[PDB]
Design a protein around this ligand. Structure first.
Ligand SMILES: [Zn+2]
Length: 139
């Protein structure tokens, strides 16, 4: 799922909610993207804006948030995050580190037990966390 299919799905999730809610405008959208995603975030925004043009979501502020990766070894059921550092990389300022998804696999091996054949619990998908809208009418 490249940036275009991603933006298309996100925009569809936003406009659908706005439709059933009877919204008159979409003010903001918060999107969470896993750190394992290889998509270029500015392209996803660029595509979202192009799909929002002429809709009630035109002008909506878009906020992207990173979701840390979390794995669960299906051999010892242990759960760890990349920053875990059971063995902390030479650089102790762990928050300081940024992994590259295309070559992250080498660092993936369960710390407490053996290694590999894990399950990705978080940090892989993309999802809309919140949508801010405006509505009119009532009494
Ligand atoms: Zn394990």
């Amino acid at each position: 799922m490249h940036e275009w299919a991603l933006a298309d799905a996100i925009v569809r999730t936003v406009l659908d909610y706005a439709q059933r809610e009877g919204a008159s405008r979409v003010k903001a959208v918060r999107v969470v993207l896993g750190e394992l995603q290889d998509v270029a975030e500015d392209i996803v925004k660029f595509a979202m804006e192009q799909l929002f043009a002429g809709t009630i979501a035109e002008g909506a502020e878009i906020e992207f948030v990173e979701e840390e990766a979390v794995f669960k070894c299906r051999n010892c059921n242990y759960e760890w995050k990349l920053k875990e550092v059971k063995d902390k990389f030479d650089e102790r300022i762990k928050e300081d580190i940024h992994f590259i998804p295309e070559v992250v696999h080498a660092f993936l091996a369960c710390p407490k037990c053996g290694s590999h054949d894990f399950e990705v619990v978080k940090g892989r998908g993309v999802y809309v966390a919140g949508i801010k809208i405006e509505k009119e009418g009532g009494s």
